[PDB]
Each structure stands twice: as C-alpha cells, then as structure tokens.
Design a protein around this ligand. Structure first.
Ligand SMILES: Cc1ccccc1C(=O)Oc1c(Br)cc(Br)cc1CNC(=O)c1ccccc1Cl
Ligand SMILES: Cc1ccccc1C(=O)Oc1c(Br)cc(Br)cc1CNC(=O)c1ccccc1Cl
Lengths: 166, 162
C-alpha cells in the first residue's frame, strides 16, 4: 500500500519512526536492505549526509572512513542522471571501484539498484535497495516486477524525506 | 521507448515519439517544458508537444507562468498535481482555469521535472473523458507507467534541450 505508506511517513514524528516506515515499505516490496541518503542544495559533504536505513553500521562507518563517496560509481551516476543504476560488476571499472565492490559485497550489497534523488529545492540523494537472490537473472526478474512501484516510492520518499532532513 | 527517445535526431522526431507514447498510453495532448539551472525565464522555456499553438501563444502573452498553480507546485514538489478545480484558488487562477479549459485542458495532470544538473520542468498530460471521475480513474490506472515515463523524458529531453 504505497500511498498509505506515504501518508504514514507524513504523519510520523522524528527520524526513527520515519526510517521504520520506509524500511517496512521496502521489505514488504521484497527488498532486503535500504539506504536513503540526502544532501542539501550545493553540498558535497557526503560524510555528513542525512542517512536513513538498515545498511550494516560497520559498513556505513567503513564507507565514511575510506571516503568511498568519491569512488562509488552510484554516487557519480546520481550527479548526472535521474534514472536508476543497477548494481552490476560492469559499473565497477577503476581499480579502487573493484576494491569497493569486494568490500560492499562482503557487507551483503551484491544485487540491487540505486534511484537518484533530485529534490525541488536542489536536494541531492539516493535511494539504494539490495535484493537477496541466487543469481543475477532472478534478481533482475524481481527488480523488473516491482520497478514501477519503486519508481513512485523513490519520489514519495524524497518529498517526505526532504522535509525531515531539512 | 526511451531508446527511441535517445535514438532520435532533432526536436521534431523527439516530439513525435513522445506524443505517440502519450497517445498510446491514452492521453490526448502533452506538454514537456524545461528550463536550465537558476532560470525563471518561462517565456523562453524549451517546450515540446501538441498543445494548441494559439493556447501556447496566449499563455506567453498573459504571462500565465506567474499564476499557473502547477508551476508553483513544480517549484516545491516532485509529486504529480492532478488538475482538480481545487488547485485554482485565486481570481487570476479561476480565469486561467476558464481559458485553459477552452483550450481542451480540462482533465489531466502535471509531473514536475527536476533534473540532475538543476533543470526545472513539467510534463503535463491532458485526458479526454466524459467526466472528471472517469478521467481520474484512467490516470490512476496508468500512473506507474507515467511516473517512469516522466523521468525518461527528463533525462533524454535535458540532453536535447541543453
Ligand atoms: C547522500 C547522497 C547523495 C547522492 C548520492 C548518494 C548519496 C549517498 O547517500 O551515498 C552513500 C553514502 Br554517503 C553512504 C553509503 Br554506506 C552508501 C551510499 C550510496 N551507495 C550505495 O548505496 C551502494 C550502491 C551499490 C553498491 C554499494 C553501495 Cl554502498
Ligand atoms: C518550463 C517549466 C518549468 C517548470 C514548470 C512548468 C514549466 C512549463 O513549461 O510551464 C508551462 C509553459 Br512555460 C507554457 C504552457 Br502553455 C504550459 C505550462 C505548464 N502548465 C500546464 O501544462 C497546465 C496545467 C494545468 C492547466 C493548464 C495548463 Cl496550460
């Protein structure tokens, strides 16, 4: 129930409740782990982004410490496009990106996609969602099956989330 | 049909592809409008589509971008705005609703466009129906597809425009 979810987000109070609702929307849809990240207009301060979700804490910590925002191919994608980027080995091209892939894989981030977020007031962000699957073909099958719902979800989360972050 | 949008060469072909996509989906007339980062020069926007020419000319001449409630909505939101009578609130907006309605833009919605490089825009789509309830039923039925379509149109259109 997408619209119901949105209304729940917009009747929530504080970051904890908002994050619980969003995570449950994603979980119900069939995704595993999620990260919603948002920066205000003109900011490139990734290490101080508004971050929501259930990525493993030690991974989030590692990412900040290693300055992976500068290497993560989804981040660079988000600066150039409003279209999703699917997590495939082909997006990891540089030597650093291969290292990144290995570390993200260890944290359970193998299959999934990232939806770039570009808000009405210049907010810049991402909604990333991982998928538990036995192979790429099955992960892609699931993602296709829910892509239209998720496409609406990312914009509802952006509109609501932007008000909470800022 | 985003690959068709990208395969295309020039505005004429792009416009024809987008219009067909909207028609095939069940919409009547469409407008894709786009401005570059920081611009509020609505009278010089990049505009694509099949809105009646006389209507587009009127909108520019009356400076309706100052009163159009979908324009204000786009500055504040990434979410659709359906063309409900309730959105036209001020005296000038009532007049706008009357004139737009005469142009065949009675039922429909506008999807705000916010590009990765700060582009600001709208994809507006009108629906022919016997009443608003019937139009609203149709729009809800194709909304997921449209929601994808607007982002594909934006990514491609931004390249074409700028
Ligand atoms: C805040 C922001 C703005 C614009 C674009 C991205 C972000 C953002 O939150 O980036 C981040 C930040 Br900070 C921290 C972390 Br942990 C993760 C991301 C986004 N990257 C991914 O979700 C991802 C995708 C594929 C494989 C591995 C990973 Cl880790
Ligand atoms: C360029 C732009 C940026 C941001 C938001 C909108 C635009 C844009 O193209 O606005 C315009 C411009 Br210029 C010209 C015209 Br003719 C129409 C619009 C958008 N408005 C509508 O489509 C509409 C909606 C409901 C009822 C009647 C109408 Cl006419």
């Amino acid at each position: 129930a997408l619209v119901d979810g949105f209304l729940e987000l917009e009747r929530s109070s504080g970051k904890l409740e908002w994050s619980a609702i969003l995570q449950k929307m994603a979980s119900d849809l069939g995704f595993s782990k999620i990260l919603f990240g948002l920066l205000p207009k003109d900011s490139q301060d990734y290490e101080n982004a508004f971050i929501v979700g259930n990525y493993p804490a030690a991974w989030r910590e590692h990412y900040d410490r290693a300055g992976y925002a500068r290497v993560d191919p989804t981040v660079s994608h988000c600066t150039q496009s409003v279209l999703p980027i699917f997590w495939e080995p082909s997006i990891y091209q540089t030597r650093k990106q291969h290292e990144f892939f290995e570390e993200a894989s260890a944290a359970g981030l193998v299959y999934g996609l990232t939806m770039p977020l570009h808000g009405a007031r210049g907010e810049l962000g991402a909604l990333s969602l991982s998928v538990e699957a036995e192979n790429r073909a099955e992960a892609n099958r699931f993602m296709e099956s829910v892509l239209p719902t998720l496409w609406m979800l990312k914009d509802y989360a952006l509109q609501s989330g932007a008000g909470l972050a800022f």
